[PDB]
Amino acid sequence: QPLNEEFRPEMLQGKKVIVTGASKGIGREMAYHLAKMGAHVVVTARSKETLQKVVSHCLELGAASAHYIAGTMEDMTFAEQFVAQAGKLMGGLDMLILNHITNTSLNLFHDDIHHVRKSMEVNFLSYVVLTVAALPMLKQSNGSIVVVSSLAGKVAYPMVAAYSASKFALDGFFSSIRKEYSVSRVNVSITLCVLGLIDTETAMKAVSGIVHMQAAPKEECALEIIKGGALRQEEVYYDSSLWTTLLIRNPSRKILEFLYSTS
């Protein structure tokens, strides 16, 4: 059940939020928006020097508190330990923003099992490890899980097959536990964010010469992810095309989920 209210930046004031993949791009823009809202933030990514700079800017913007923990989400021990440390720094957890992805470029799939497994481990499995480690704190606070996904996580997309598989897996996993939490009365919301092309340095470089469309602003995108999570909405759609929002919706899937629940 989402909040039938309009978003207010005050909803995040004093909230204890983790943002992963927060050294750059959308993740960094989220940490900044949260800081301006006066949230307590714990940021993570591999790059410690850039995470240092992010935390310092968060404090300038007005974050209630800001800390970083550096490590790779390839390392499942780090993922589990990071949540416990982040929780101890803030005295709890209200929102878990799962955003990091392994480095990926546009290429036809041929024999690249390494990139398929790496995408699955980093983009999907670590999200599950982080969720398990965070849930006790989120159940205590009636908190929220925010999962960053893509158009390639809802429809087939050539040149990003391993990435698409990892994003599709997030939908299957997180949408299925959302139904389980509903019937078991676990009051932790799950927001799946479906994004189109965003003007991050990573995406702009990856798509240069190959895919040409725009390219919605990263600042506005980060805010839409936070708003959807704050409002406990099931899904957020953020793309520059009006065709997307209308056609991406799946009432047929929603009908089937309702019909197969009464069994």
Ligand X SMILES: O=S1(=O)N=C(NC2CCCCC2)O[C@H]2CCCC[C@H]21
Binding residues: 21-47, 72-73, 99-101, 150, 163-167, 198-202
- Binding-residue pattern over the window 96 to 135 for ligand NDP, x denoting contact by CB under 6 A: ---xxxxx------------------x-------------
Contacts of 165 (CB under 8 A, 6+ apart): 116, 119, 120
For the chain, what's the residue count? 263
CB of 160 to ligand NDP, least distance (A): 9
Query: Which of 4, 77, 185, 205 is in the footprint of a second copy by CB under 8 A?
Result: 4
Asked whether position 205 contacts a second copy by CB under 8 A, the answer is no
146 pairs with which residues across the strands? 97, 191
Handedness of CA 120, 122, 125, 128 (dihedral sign): negative
Candidates 41-49, 87-95, 128-136, 226-234: pick the segment binding ligand NDP (CB under 6 A). 41-49
Q: Is 21 one of the binding residues for ligand NDP (CB under 6 A)? A: yes
CB atoms within 10 A of CB 235: 18
Does residue 203 belong to the site contacting ligand NDP (CB under 6 A)?
yes
Query: Which position among 129, 137, 146, 236 is part of the footprint of a second copy (CB under 8 A)?
Result: 129
Closest CA to 17 of 146, 200, 126, 170: 146
CA distance 220 to 3: 21
Q: Establish if 149 lies at the interface with a second copy (CB under 8 A).
A: no
Q: Do 251 and 169 touch, CB atoms closer than 8 A? A: no
Structure tokens of 177?
């536990």
Catalytic-role residue among 68, 127, 157, 163? 163
104 binds, among ligand X, a second copy, ligand NDP, none (CB under 5 to 8 A by kind): ligand X
- Minimum distance from CB of 25 to ligand X (Å)? 8
Q: Which residue has the tokens 């790496």?
A: 118
Annotated binding-site ranges for substrate: 150
Establish whether 163 is a catalytic residue.
Answer: yes
Q: What is the DSSP string of 97-161?
A: EE-----------SS-HHHHHHHIIIIIIHHHHHHHHHHHHHHHHT-EEEEEEEGGGTS--TT-H
Query: Which positions lie near ligand X, rule CB under 6 A?
Result: 104, 106, 150-152, 157, 160, 163, 195-197, 202-203, 206-207, 211
User: Which residues 204-263 are close enough to bind ligand NDP by CB under 6 A?
Assistant: none
Which residues sit opposite 144 in a β-bridge? 95, 189
Binding site for ligand NDP (CB under 6 A): 21-27, 45-47, 50, 72-74, 99-103, 122, 148, 150, 195, 197-198, 200, 202-203
Query: Would you name the residues annotated as active-site residues?
Result: 163
